[PDB]
Write a protein that binds this ligand. Structure first.
Ligand SMILES: *CCC(=O)Nc1ccc(OC)c(Nc2cc(-c3[nH]c(CCCO)nc3-c3ccc(F)cc3)ccn2)c1
Ligand SMILES: *CCC(=O)Nc1ccc(OC)c(Nc2cc(-c3[nH]c(CCCO)nc3-c3ccc(F)cc3)ccn2)c1
Ligand SMILES: [Cl-]
Ligand SMILES: [Cl-]
Lengths: 314, 303
């Protein structure tokens, strides 16, 4: 399986730490091809230890699946280093993750960017469902910005790889994303494509609120209770009722009543052709998608892979 | 049209000098998109102050042409900054130019890399000929290494834009009459191949440029490289025929070097060649996904 490069400790080095999450620590790194004089920037995540003593062969098998994804909106695992720690290597995304991007660019994001991001996340998740892969940790922090016009899903399958100890599902601010999880996942560890759809709804809510924390101030131990009582995330100020109803449909108790990712692609694509009808943002008229000139420059410089055209307004 | 972005001085910064040529100084630069927090590496060439400056409308017209090339083996001009100086911006090639690459790798380059580089250069030049574009300064220094498996021609059209003269790469008719054609580009292709097969030797070492037209008229040519079978050397000699129309075509050079690339050790005799193969599919997939995602024809591999 030539899609996963087995790297030795000697051919790459971790430099600047970029962040930390439930799954490990992310570094900006340099790959030094053997026999060459160049240093190639990469992203390295040094994983925390799985909650099970699984063979390196099982770790490699699951890494091969992560290296097999071929879709413009899913990040492909490129390499792995199995020494004392498991280190994953992929292409460096210099714009960061979408959660931090929307927080940092709050007052300058228009409806066309927001709706296209929802389309692209749904396209990537639809591909994962087609591959019979459940993400288990879809969130705005796990959507990466290759360019502001091109986002890609990362960290799929890591939850099942590393697992989580049972106490973390009852702790505060722990490793378990309780506030993104479907009720059936909280209560019974049930993870399906339809529970991914629930997390997609929370992810869209993150984007439409420009990075607000869902259920902020509500203890994680009481999330399952308030969900059972019918409480849900509030309507973001910029969202029309059409957009808010889609999010609410993603959080229905009956998993089979939730939308499908293929349906979400179509609906958000429709709204992207009339963006100001579905999101109300002030000064939206000067927050257009890039001109063809800037798009050509963007692509040739740092994003040469094939991708569907962004959905523009009619 | 929309293929050439006009940049402001404030949105990019030169950080490192990478090299210099007859036309100007090359910098590693950082592009800083307005409103963003990222710094994107780019290559910047600041052109030197010409003695017969061109009009700004003329400069932009040629920059649009340079920005219109769409081929995996020709570098596309991406941006320009037109102030007191002309600055050209394109994607940064971190492996450098092919001339310095083959010199630094003098002792580890295998026959399969050398022959494929000849294939790829011929593919890029054939595209330029398809576009009715004459390069005028093809040389190993003007071939850039995006990956060791993927080289691209740069600096086409700069010679005409700026009106220092690479006599030892030029066809005789270009030396005598300043005639530049696709067939004179073929002559420079022959010298470029000689550079690669000698691992970056200087052509006509010890002969002053003022004497080159004289020795060419006497029938003297660059010698057979030690690693080249006569099959490869005969192609080079055909590129240096006095009659431009008897020289090979770039389309023909693609086919011949591709043919040799399928049995590389038959056509280049290199010491230790039984070690330096092309990357495995694993290593090639890793290279492309990391830094070379553009569409390209696959390498010609030995069968
Ligand atoms: C908000 C989370 C984040 O990743 N921020 C961020 C700041 C600066 C960056 O470069 C200047 C990047 N680039 C990047 C990140 C990742 C990545 N992000 C995560 C989530 C962390 C917390 O949610 N995980 C990864 C990752 C890294 C390496 C792998 F092999 C697999 C997954 C990937 C690529 N580029 C991001
Ligand atoms: C052989 C000369 C050379 O360019 N060496 C080299 C050393 C280090 C590098 O990056 C670490 C690069 N990258 C690169 C170079 C160029 C480029 N090279 C030339 C010719 C120099 C002598 O002929 N001209 C350019 C150039 C730059 C910007 C433009 F708009 C047009 C042409 C381009 C991209 N990356 C090279
Ligand atoms: Cl993480
Ligand atoms: Cl130059």
């Amino acid at each position: 399986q030539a899609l996963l490069r087995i790297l030795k400790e000697t051919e790459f080095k971790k430099i600047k730490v970029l962040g930390s999450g439930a799954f490990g620590t992310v570094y900006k790194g340099l790959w030094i091809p053997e026999g060459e004089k160049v240093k190639i920037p990469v992203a390295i995540k040094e994983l925390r230890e799985a909650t099970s003593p699984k063979a390196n062969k099982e770790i490699l098998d699951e890494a091969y699946v992560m290296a097999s994804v071929d879709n413009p909106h899913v990040c492909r695992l490129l390499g792995i280093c199995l020494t004392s720690t498991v280190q994953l290597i992929m292409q460096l995304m210099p714009f960061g993750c979408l959660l931090d991007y929307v927080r940092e660019h709050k007052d300058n994001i228009g409806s066309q960017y927001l709706l296209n991001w929802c389309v692209q996340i749904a396209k990537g998740m639809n591909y994962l469902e087609d591959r019979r892969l459940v993400h288990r940790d879809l969130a705005a922090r796990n959507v990466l910005v290759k360019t502001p016009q091109h986002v890609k899903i990362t960290d799929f399958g890591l939850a099942k790889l590393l697992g989580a100890e049972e106490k973390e599902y009852h702790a505060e601010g722990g490793k378990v994303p309780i506030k993104w999880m479907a009720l059936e996942s909280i209560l019974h560890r049930i993870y399906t494509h339809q529970s991914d759809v629930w997390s997609y709804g929370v992810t869209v809510w993150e984007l439409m609120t420009f990075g607000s924390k869902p259920y902020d101030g509500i203890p994680a131990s009481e999330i399952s209770s308030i969900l059972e009582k019918g409480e849900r995330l509030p309507q973001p100020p910029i969202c029309t009722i059409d957009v808010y109803m889609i999010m609410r449909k993603c959080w229905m108790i009956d998993a089979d009543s939730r939308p499908k990712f293929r349906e979400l692609i179509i609906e958000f694509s429709k709204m992207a052709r009339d963006p100001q009808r579905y999101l109300v943002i002030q000064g939206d008229e000067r927050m257009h998608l890039p001109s063809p000139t800037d798009s050509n420059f963007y692509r040739a410089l740092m994003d040469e892979e094939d991708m569907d055209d962004v959905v523009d307004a009619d």
